[PDB]
Structures are given as structure tokens and as C-alpha cells.
Amino acid sequence: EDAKGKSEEELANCFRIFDKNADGFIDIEELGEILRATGEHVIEEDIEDLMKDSDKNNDGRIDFDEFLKMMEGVQ
């Protein structure tokens, strides 16, 4: 289904672009605005699922490992 190209390197940097507050980790609260900014009208019930597929250590926060994992398979 076509290739996305890009590479982990680029995504790596984006990491800091997500953590706009002293957190060093992406939590659900941050996911809200992030997704809300787009035109998908996401609701907590949906944003929560995104964290589940990522949160591999039950830390209520997506890190670089869990984050990249999702970015690779968006949606």
C-alpha cells in the first residue's frame, strides 16, 4: 500500500515537539490537543485506546519506544 519513507530519526526529534511541558513523556492529556488540533474530532474514549496500544509499561504515558511503535502503524 505505498511506502511512507521518512525514518525513525525524523520521528525521534518530533518527540520533544510533543512534550510541550516538563514531562519527558507523552500522556493522554497531551494527546487530546495534539489530535484535537486536526479535523478528526476525537473523544477521550478514542484517545484512551491510542494510549493502551502504546502504554507498554502501564505508565499512563507514551514514551519514545511505545510512541514510535504507534507512529509506524498510525490508526
> The cell 484512551 sits on which residue?
48
User: Minimal distance in Å, beta carbon 22 to Ca ion?
Assistant: 8
Residue pair 38/22 in contact by the 8 Å Cβ criterion? no
**Candidate list 57, 73, 74, 75; residue touching Ca ion; CB under 5 A:** 57
Q: How many CA within 13 A on the CB side of residue 28? A: 16
**Candidate list 46, 48, 53, 59; residue touching Ca ion; CB under 5 A:** 59
Q: What single-letter amino acid sits at 60?
A: G
Binding residues for Ca(2+) are 19, 21, 23, 30, 55, 57, 59, 61, 66
Query: What does the binding site for Ca ion look like in residue numbers (CB under 5 A)?
Result: 19, 21, 23, 30, 55, 57, 59, 66
